[PDB]
Enzyme design. Structure first.
Site, PDB file in Angstrom:
ATOM      1  N   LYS A 180       0.831  -1.225   0.000  1.00  0.00           N
ATOM      2  CA  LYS A 180       0.000   0.000   0.000  1.00  0.00           C
ATOM      3  C   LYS A 180       0.855   1.260   0.000  1.00  0.00           C
ATOM      4  O   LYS A 180       0.610   2.106  -0.849  1.00  0.00           O
ATOM      5  CB  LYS A 180      -0.841   0.105   1.270  1.00  0.00           C
ATOM      6  CG  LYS A 180      -1.676  -1.110   1.640  1.00  0.00           C
ATOM      7  CD  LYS A 180      -2.705  -0.800   2.700  1.00  0.00           C
ATOM      8  CE  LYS A 180      -2.094  -0.464   4.040  1.00  0.00           C
ATOM      9  NZ  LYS A 180      -1.368  -1.625   4.604  1.00  0.00           N
ATOM     10  N   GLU A 220       1.124   4.898  11.960  1.00  0.00           N
ATOM     11  CA  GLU A 220       2.111   4.290  11.028  1.00  0.00           C
ATOM     12  C   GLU A 220       3.544   4.387  11.571  1.00  0.00           C
ATOM     13  O   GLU A 220       3.707   4.899  12.678  1.00  0.00           O
ATOM     14  CB  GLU A 220       1.995   4.898   9.633  1.00  0.00           C
ATOM     15  CG  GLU A 220       1.265   3.994   8.657  1.00  0.00           C
ATOM     16  CD  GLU A 220       2.106   2.890   8.038  1.00  0.00           C
ATOM     17  OE1 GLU A 220       3.342   3.025   8.029  1.00  0.00           O
ATOM     18  OE2 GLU A 220       1.520   1.899   7.563  1.00  0.00           O
ATOM     19  N   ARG A 221       4.522   3.837  10.838  1.00  0.00           N
ATOM     20  CA  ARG A 221       5.932   3.786  11.323  1.00  0.00           C
ATOM     21  C   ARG A 221       6.555   5.183  11.316  1.00  0.00           C
ATOM     22  O   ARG A 221       6.110   6.021  10.506  1.00  0.00           O
ATOM     23  CB  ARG A 221       6.764   2.833  10.460  1.00  0.00           C
ATOM     24  CG  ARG A 221       6.749   1.387  10.936  1.00  0.00           C
ATOM     25  CD  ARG A 221       7.124   0.405   9.840  1.00  0.00           C
ATOM     26  NE  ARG A 221       6.838   0.912   8.505  1.00  0.00           N
ATOM     27  CZ  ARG A 221       5.684   0.748   7.870  1.00  0.00           C
ATOM     28  NH1 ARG A 221       4.696   0.086   8.448  1.00  0.00           N
ATOM     29  NH2 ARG A 221       5.520   1.249   6.658  1.00  0.00           N
TER      30      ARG A 221
HETATM   31  N1  LIG Z   1       6.114  -1.861  -6.534  1.00  0.00           N
HETATM   32  C1  LIG Z   1       6.963  -2.544  -5.727  1.00  0.00           C
HETATM   33  N2  LIG Z   1       8.106  -3.079  -6.208  1.00  0.00           N
HETATM   34  C2  LIG Z   1       8.956  -3.759  -5.417  1.00  0.00           C
HETATM   35  N3  LIG Z   1       8.751  -3.966  -4.105  1.00  0.00           N
HETATM   36  C3  LIG Z   1       7.646  -3.483  -3.492  1.00  0.00           C
HETATM   37  C4  LIG Z   1       6.667  -2.729  -4.287  1.00  0.00           C
HETATM   38  N4  LIG Z   1       5.680  -2.372  -3.447  1.00  0.00           N
HETATM   39  C5  LIG Z   1       5.999  -2.855  -2.219  1.00  0.00           C
HETATM   40  N5  LIG Z   1       7.168  -3.518  -2.248  1.00  0.00           N
HETATM   41  C6  LIG Z   1       7.820  -4.174  -1.089  1.00  0.00           C
HETATM   42  O1  LIG Z   1       6.840  -4.766  -0.235  1.00  0.00           O
HETATM   43  C7  LIG Z   1       7.128  -4.481   1.137  1.00  0.00           C
HETATM   44  C8  LIG Z   1       5.859  -4.078   1.872  1.00  0.00           C
HETATM   45  O2  LIG Z   1       5.324  -2.919   1.238  1.00  0.00           O
HETATM   46  P1  LIG Z   1       5.057  -1.569   2.071  1.00  0.00           P
HETATM   47  O3  LIG Z   1       3.999  -0.774   1.350  1.00  0.00           O
HETATM   48  O4  LIG Z   1       6.392  -0.934   2.372  1.00  0.00           O
HETATM   49  O5  LIG Z   1       4.439  -2.114   3.456  1.00  0.00           O
HETATM   50  P2  LIG Z   1       2.853  -2.327   3.643  1.00  0.00           P
HETATM   51  O6  LIG Z   1       2.473  -3.287   2.544  1.00  0.00           O
HETATM   52  O7  LIG Z   1       2.730  -2.905   5.034  1.00  0.00           O
HETATM   53  O8  LIG Z   1       2.270  -0.942   3.493  1.00  0.00           O
HETATM   54  C9  LIG Z   1       8.160  -3.366   1.167  1.00  0.00           C
HETATM   55  O9  LIG Z   1       9.277  -3.741   1.976  1.00  0.00           O
HETATM   56  C10 LIG Z   1       8.576  -3.139  -0.273  1.00  0.00           C
HETATM   57  O10 LIG Z   1       9.987  -3.297  -0.441  1.00  0.00           O
HETATM   58 MG   LIG Z   2       0.883  -2.280   5.837  1.00  0.00          MG
END
Ligand SMILES: Nc1ncnc2c1ncn2[C@@H]1O[C@H](COP(=O)(O)OP(=O)(O)O)[C@@H](O)[C@H]1O
Ligand SMILES: [Mg+2]
Ligand SMILES: Nc1ncnc2c1ncn2[C@@H]1O[C@H](COP(=O)(O)OP(=O)(O)OP(=O)(O)O)[C@@H](O)[C@H]1O
Ligand SMILES: [Mg+2]
Lengths: 463, 48, 489, 463
Positions: D153, D179-180
């Site tokens: 997200k 959030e973090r």
């Molecule tokens: N478009 C993308 N390409 C590569 N890696 C991704 C992408 N979107 C998310 N990620 C990876 O997925 C992990 C979780 O996504 P993130 O949005 O940071 O946390 P959350 O899903 O809890 O919001 C992250 O560590 C990130 O590196």
């Molecule tokens: Mg999340």
């Protein structure tokens, strides 16, 4: 002497009386200044009683006065309540004038004792072929109708009560509460249409009415049926009275709706603590006494479309026959469409019905089940298989399915008031002939809309 | 005929795998339903 | 005194009020500052009230008085083409409304002696609902489905297609955010369908009491025309939002919970609302108007809406509603995503009233499509395996596919009785056996358009009378044969 | 005017008062002893007010004293807040000196009337293939992202910020809730190095604070955006506004945490009784009225990875465009993990977007649904049995599922590949060509993480 309301929540009303005069359980009180009657459900000490409201809540306020009738809710019964529509408490709602009778009976009575049961299981003859062959009826039994997906329940009940009206002396009762109102109107107009409205009594309970009215309704229908059964001719044979109850599910639901506010904990999937008791109090009064016999027909809806829910679980333990009809075959054109394989009875025993009837019913059931498992779509190749091994099974299944169809008096379209109440033997002998194969030459379409085996013989022989 | 035997044996094995997964899901759902019913009963009994 | 009371507790729209000894049930109460409250609990020593308004300006010690008059709404014919709040206050800012009748909101239904059967239709403009699941005046039919599956579109099309019928329409919105209400009102205004309609709005920001009381006020406004011999049609945007609001307003009142935390009196809440939709008899109309109107019968049809969670039709509320309504229309997500719009499930949707409601030609013609669709439901499992079957099943599957592809129609495009009649006759008589499974929609549109342009005099006769006769059959056959050739799709 | 603390439990403090001066609802009070601001949440008779404490509760005993400000939590508005970081109460936390403005607005107000709503019709193009093709957006609308932990997200929210706010003339407000912190610092520095800080206001309340601070931190960003919308240039036209909420689920989770301590009965799965009204009184104020237009983007958290939970079920109807993230597609390595089904937008109809756009989207969704339905028989039986057309559908669905993947600008660090951007017409052309059948021979391994139909041709040749 007199009491005053002290708490109103929903339909549950707490009233308080002097230390000495506390109305007993189920006694009825009159609230002055309003049409409201109060029914006692529990005692709470300190001269306080929980009550439900019989009637509707017309702006009751705290501190209103109330006197006690010192007697349960007594419904006026007799021969002067024939062909009239009355409310739960016994007031007419057809604007045809007051009921001129004096015999009043309480609606809370104990069930027949152990020593008063009948000494035999005779079977009530019916003009319907299917109910008389694969699910015999009991002259004291309490059958139930779970057939859904169809409005024919009212039409089927109309044919049944009308053939019964000719078959049975009379004095039937219809206790419809929480039913589809236009269906009740169709009931009333149908009964007036066939000029059989006399000798029948009707008690209707409207869904908008408080739970007090939506409850203690079947009780009234039950009380009226009893005064009739016990009635005796100079000969002394009481009458075989019938009773109809459109919904019991609504009875249980009203109980559930009022239970929580009465100070009782939840149980099961949310039902009241007292489910089996509340249903037994009603189901144990529909019995075939030595003198007279009351039979009942009740339409029961299964919530969530499962047979495991506690309300149908407690319901199935009281019935003697279960009849289920579905549109899946009704669509074919069989007007009296009832699923033959699904129907079940505790009276299809070989001894009570005769060995021949038992074996022929079993044979017909086996043929139907064989055809069901060997569908022409189940076998993609369709026909040209098991010649006279399963082909003949297919043809016999078709012939029996068409022979299920029965013309009726009420359906005036295409029929000159036939009213065919076929002799039970004739049906048995016709099915024996069909099983033996002597009818394998008869055209299949000749077996549809047939009044009787002779009738079908004539229909085949003309062309 | 030699193909049909292996075809049906593979079908049986796949059916076994699928029924195992469905059993897992069924157990999870059953525990959740029991927990929900008990919670509802206790909450209602606290109200009265 | 016996009529003056104080406020003791204020919390989340619920007020615990001292005093007020002669306070009736459901009787309006007057807070200082022009705020109106109801009365829902009368305990031994305190009264529970819900404040319809903004309770944020009420404190302890603020006085209150008992009015002695139950909830009433203004009714009349002036409310047509208007948008009002639950209690009848205009909000579109087009000036005050002067309807000259005030009516109670909680009344009883007519008795069983005064009611009558259902013999006349109510068109929805959709081929599937108009030929498979007919609706008649006085009937209560329920639309049930899942989020984002076309549930409202059907109700709005139903409101739009009563332009010539002459029946008033009422629309109730519960829980929706105000942008969607504004959009719906604009769309109604665009097509000229707003002259005959009234809108009651209790949006998401509005209190729980408003969302609890909206449908009753809508029904009271709809009863006005039924009791006077003219027809009516009421639509509830979502009684689910209403059930949730009732649960909140009850749990806040300390009432015992139950299955899914819904307290008692949940069945009553929807039953007493859905029982008021019925057809009265001419004697009732004559008695109500004291002879002003003679020889006419009133009616009020209903089409409420309920949503499900991933097809869980066995939850607490949908089962209650399914047990009360005469018929049920099911919308499926796996059908909507497949392009079959409107996504109506034919094998679970039934109507009790049936053919009596439909006209003569529709009743005569719907049977072939009904039986074809029923059979096509059975051979469905054997669809990935066409080669292993006899020619009969092949032809049946083909016909079922063609029929299920003719039942697809665009939004805001109601068809007329003649359009449905011509299309169904073309289907039943095997006039679409030469066209592939695709292009069916184009063929339907082209045939309908051509028939309106060249055979308009007949079309008018079919529309006005709705009769079936050998001359009509011959004319329809001749026209379809003429269009089949000498034209493009 | 001075009150004494009576009870402290968790974050809930109930405080007495004098009889004639009880503070009203939502007013703010100050403890004289320490730094703490309490907010009124309910009245309990006898001049006792229940309150939620904004800040730490350690070191607070009974008998502490409190004064009343007699006014809600006011925050400073205006242009002074551009390029600054603020607490939940407005206090700066960037160590850059006080904020110079006397313009204070309360954070508790009513929603806009129905009469002043506005219609949003102008389109907005992000640059992401799946969003601009299947779930199109429009200026002044509302957008939501639904997913479970670890699905993508935030990396999408930041990509949208990169592709929209950086290239847009107009102000912006960013509020972070539940959030973090590391992400907050990273965002602040990333905006600083790009010299676009002076156009953004910021508010941060993170998971490390007691629920009182996490519960009322979205309203502050809301009030700031509200002022930035209604403000008009002198003899000049207004400007657009943008709003970003990092996680709105925590707003309801705080209430769930503190609901039972307020005295409310539990409901459904442990949620507070008043949920939807609580969601609406906030989600209605995010509006684009006749004065200005606010384009908001929110990320919504899905507890336990099911969309049937009440919290993500109530919020579905409050958004114009919804984008649903799937964990299975993520585990498959497809990024971004956006489900083509279950993703809708209220701007996909033939009038608003045209005809070709609508046809392309509909055909794509149809093909994907067909494949998803077909998966089961493949699972049980195998591949050879299906019809050749169904094999073609399988291959097309696989290629389509891959082609929706795309590398990002803010995700170079994770994968080491540079970002990409695709114009909308290129998306349309590529999908039309794919569904036509001209790209069937190209191996399905060339459709992964490449933007535009041409790059795919080059990658296919590269293999
Ligand atoms: N478009 C993308 N390409 C590569 N890696 C991704 C992408 N979107 C998310 N990620 C990876 O997925 C992990 C979780 O996504 P993130 O949005 O940071 O946390 P959350 O899903 O809890 O919001 C992250 O560590 C990130 O590196
Ligand atoms: Mg999340
Ligand atoms: N017959 C149809 N053909 C094509 N698209 C349709 C059709 N009917 C509806 N739609 C589309 O489906 C959506 C309508 O959704 P709907 O009004 O049912 O929303 P909801 O969330 O289920 O309802 P509610 O109004 O109760 O919130 C719109 O995108 C509309 O374009
Ligand atoms: Mg809707």
């Amino acid at each position: 002497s007199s009491g005053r309301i002290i708490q109103i929540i929903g339909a549950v009303i707490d009233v308080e009386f002097e230390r000495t005069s506390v109305p007993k359980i189920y006694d009825a009180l009159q609230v002055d200044g309003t049409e409201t009657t109060l029914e006692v459900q529990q005692q709470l000490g300190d001269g306080v009683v929980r009550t439900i409201a019989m009637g509707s809540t017309e702006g009751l306020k705290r501190g209103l006065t109330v006197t006690s009738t010192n007697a349960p809710i007594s419904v006026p019964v007799g021969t002067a309540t024939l062909g009239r529509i009355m409310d739960v408490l016994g007031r007419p709602i057809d604007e045809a004038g007051p009921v001129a009778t004096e015999e009043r009976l309480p609606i809370h009575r104990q069930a027949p004792s152990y020593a008063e049961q009948a000494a035999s299981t005779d079977l009530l003859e019916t003009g319907i072929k299917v109910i008389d062959l694969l699910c015999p009826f009991a002259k004291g039994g309490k059958v139930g109708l779970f057939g859904g997906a169809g409005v024919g329940k009212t039409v089927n009940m109309m044919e049944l009560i009308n053939n019964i009206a000719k078959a049975h002396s009379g004095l039937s009762v219809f206790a419809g509460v929480g039913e589809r109102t236009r269906e009740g109107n169709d009931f009333y107009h149908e009964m007036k249409d066939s000029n059989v409205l006399d000798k029948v009594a009707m008690v209707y309970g409207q869904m908008n009415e408080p739970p007090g009215n939506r409850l203690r309704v079947a009780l009234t229908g039950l009380t009226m049926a009893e005064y009739f059964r016990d009635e005796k001719d100079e000969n002394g044979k009481g009458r075989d009275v019938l009773l109809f109850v459109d919904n019991i599910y609504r009875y249980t639901l009203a109980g559930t709706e009022v239970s929580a506010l009465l100070g009782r904990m939840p149980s099961a999937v949310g039902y009241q603590p007292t489910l089996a008791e509340e249903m037994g109090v009603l189901q144990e009064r529909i019995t075939s006494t030595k003198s007279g016999s009351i039979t009942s027909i009740q339409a029961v809806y299964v919530p969530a479309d499962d047979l495991t829910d506690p309300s149908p679980a407690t319901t199935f333990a009281h019935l003697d026959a279960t009849v289920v009809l579905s549109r899946d075959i009704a669509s074919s054109g069989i007007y009296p469409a009832i699923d033959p394989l699904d129907s079940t009875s505790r009276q299809l025993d070989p001894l009570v019905v005769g060995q021949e009837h038992y074996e022929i019913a079993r044979a017909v059931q086996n043929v139907l089940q064989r055809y069901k498992e060997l569908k022409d779509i189940i076998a993609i190749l369709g026909m040209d298989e098991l010649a006279e091994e399963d082909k003949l099974v297919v043809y016999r299944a078709r012939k029996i399915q068409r022979f299920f169809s029965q013309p009726f008096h009420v359906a005036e379209v295409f029929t000159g008031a036939p009213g065919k109440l076929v002799p039970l033997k004739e049906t048995i002998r016709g099915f024996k002939g069909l099983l033996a194969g002597e009818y394998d030459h008869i055209p299949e379409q000749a077996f549809y809309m047939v009044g009787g085996i002779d009738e079908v013989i004539a229909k085949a022989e003309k062309l | 005929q030699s193909a049909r035997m292996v075809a049906m044996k593979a079908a049986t094995d796949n059916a076994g795998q699928l029924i195992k997964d469905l059993q897992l899901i069924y157990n999870k759902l059953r525990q959740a339903a029991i927990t929900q019913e008990i919670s509802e009963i206790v909450g209602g009994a606290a109200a009265v | 005194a016996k009529n003056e009371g104080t406020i003791v507790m204020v919390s989340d729209g619920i007020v615990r009020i001292h005093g007020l000894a002669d306070a009736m049930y459901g009787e309006m109460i007057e807070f200082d500052g022009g705020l109106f409250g109801m009365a829902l609990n009368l305990e031994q020593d305190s009264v529970g009230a819900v404040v319809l308004g903004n309770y944020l300006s009420l404190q302890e010690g603020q006085k209150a008085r008992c009015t002695g008059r139950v909830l009433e709404v203004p009714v009349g014919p002036e409310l047509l083409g208007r948008v009002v709040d639950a209690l009848g206050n205009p909000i579109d800012g087009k000036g005050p409304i002067d309807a000259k009748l005030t009516d109670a909101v909680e009344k009883v239904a007519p008795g069983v002696i005064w009611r009558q059967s259902v013999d006349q239709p109510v068109q929805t403009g959709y081929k599937s609902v108009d030929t498979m699941i007919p609706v008649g005046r006085g009937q209560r039919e329920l639309i049930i489905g899942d989020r984002q599956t076309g549930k409202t579109a059907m109700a709005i099309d139903a409101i739009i297609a009563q332009k010539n019928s002459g029946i008033k329409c009422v629309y109730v919105a519960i829980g929706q955010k105000q942008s969607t209400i504004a959009n719906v009102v604009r769309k109604l205004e665009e097509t000229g369908a707003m002259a005959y309609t009234t809108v009651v709005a209790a949006a998401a920001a509005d209190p729980a009491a408003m969302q609890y009381l909206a449908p009753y006020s809508g029904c009271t406004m709809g009863e006005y025309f039924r009791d006077r011999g003219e027809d009516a049609l009421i639509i509830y945007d979502d009684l689910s939002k209403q059930a949730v609001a009732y649960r909140q307003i009850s749990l806040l009142l300390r009432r015992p919970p139950g299955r899914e935390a819904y307290p008692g009196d949940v069945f009553y809440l929807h039953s007493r609302l859905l029982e008021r939709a019925s057809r009265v008899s001419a004697e009732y109309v004559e008695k109500f108007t004291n002879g002003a109107v003679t020889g006419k019968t009133g009616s009020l049809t209903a089409l409420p809406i309920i949503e499900t969670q991933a097809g869980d039709v066995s939850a607490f509320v949908p089962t209650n509603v399914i047990s009360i309504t005469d018929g049920q229309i099911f919308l499926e997500t796996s059908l909507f995503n497949a392009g079959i719009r409107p996504a109506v499930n034919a094998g679970i949707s039934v109507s009790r009233v049936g053919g009596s409601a439909q006209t003569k030609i529709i009743k005569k013609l719907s049977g072939g499509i009904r039986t074809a669709l029923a059979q096509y439901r059975e051979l469905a499992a054997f669809a990935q395996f066409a080669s292993d079957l006899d020619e009969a099943t092949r032809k049946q599957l083909e016909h079922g596919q063609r029929v299920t592809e003719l039942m697809k129609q665009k939004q805001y495009a109601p068809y007329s009785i003649a359009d449905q009649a011509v299309s169904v006759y073309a289907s039943n008589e095997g006039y679409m056996a030469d066209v592939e499974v695709k292009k069916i929609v184009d063929f339907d549109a082209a045939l309908i358009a051509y028939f309106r342009s060249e055979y308009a005099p007949l079309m008018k006769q079919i529309d006005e009378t709705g009769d079936y006769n050998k001359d009509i059959e011959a004319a329809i056959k001749a026209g379809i044969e003429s269009f089949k050739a000498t034209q493009t799709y």
